[PDB]
Design a protein around this ligand. Structure first.
Ligand SMILES: [Ca+2]
Ligand SMILES: [Ca+2]
Ligand SMILES: [Ca+2]
Ligand SMILES: [Cl-]
Ligand SMILES: [Cl-]
Ligand SMILES: [Cl-]
Lengths: 179, 176
């Protein structure tokens, strides 16, 4: 399943399209279970750098985003595993965008190439996320700006502090306590 | 000349943009309120029905009757008070082609009144209207519809509307 022509990559994308925004954007434990049953092995292969060849194809690169940015957020909830492949997802998102892959998938799926930037605790990534979401507009843009505001304010996502064993600052504590 | 006022409402909203339309910013809500409170009430008293004659002025009615309450009357029955009027005007604006006259970025404000109506017919209509828009706007229209097909209404409003949450609504509410 090493090449962009892999059945596995197409399977991941087919699974995502079938699930739809009903599942992409609204928490559901059955969907988490389902995603894990199908694609846990694929996640680990991607994380082991066995699927770098998927960067050759637009939809196979989308599959990489789904495995390395989305999968951990569905399937490793409440643990440091949720963030473990984020640097890899970002590295791949950058490469995919350089190849024009985000422009090659449908408008509905484009945001999955941009979410790794929203999920990074660094200002450059956040500004890049907002620029990339500008053409998508509406709620895509709103969400990118929501993330950028937290990072520009704290340099990180204070909601992660417990899981990552970081010391919460007074202003972060304030922010957390109030929403 | 209330023409200038309708234009001002649209320009306020257009320039604020999607980084403010969906946020919960008390400063923005206060700004919107202090500028357009009188306009909202004039529209609610049926003093601005003439704005149906134009596309942008009809958009202004949507912003005054559907969005304004949601920014400026939060957590109160006033959030819903002008919803029937907003749906009435949206129906008329769509009959006149005004939704199709404005770009997709702003067109959705003609359709949100249908997603905000506690009426399964309105919800099905909202899904049809958002269908060509797709993306997150269609998704949210479908989500609202899914809530209403089931219940006939929005359980999240039970507190405000002093409704006894049924057992099914109750367990719907505790879950997510
Ligand atoms: Ca090849
Ligand atoms: Ca904002
Ligand atoms: Ca669209
Ligand atoms: Cl956070
Ligand atoms: Cl959208
Ligand atoms: Cl509800």
């Amino acid at each position: 399943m090493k090449n962009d022509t892999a059945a596995l990559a197409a399977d991941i994308v087919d699974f995502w399209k079938k699930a739809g925004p009903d599942k992409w954007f609204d928490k559901d434990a059955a969907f988490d279970n389902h995603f894990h049953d199908r694609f846990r092995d694929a996640h680990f292969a991607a994380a082991r750098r066995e699927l770098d060849g998927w960067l050759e194809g637009a939809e196979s690169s989308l599959a990489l985003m789904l495995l390395l940015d989305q999968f951990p957020r569905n399937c490793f909830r409440g643990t440091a595993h949720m963030y473990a492949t984020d640097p890899l997802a970002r590295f791949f998102a950058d490469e995919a965008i350089r190849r024009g892959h985000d422009q090659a998938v449908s408008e509905d799926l484009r945001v999955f190439f941009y979410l790794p930037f929203s999920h990074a605790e660094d200002i450059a990534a956040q500004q890049r996320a907002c620029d990339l979401n500008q053409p998508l507009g509406g709620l895509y843009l709103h969400h990118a700006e929501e993330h950028r505001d937290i990072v520009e304010r704290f340099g990180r996502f204070p909601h992660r502090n417990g899981i990552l064993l970081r010391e919460t600052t007074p202003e972060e504590r304030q922010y957390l306590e109030e929403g």
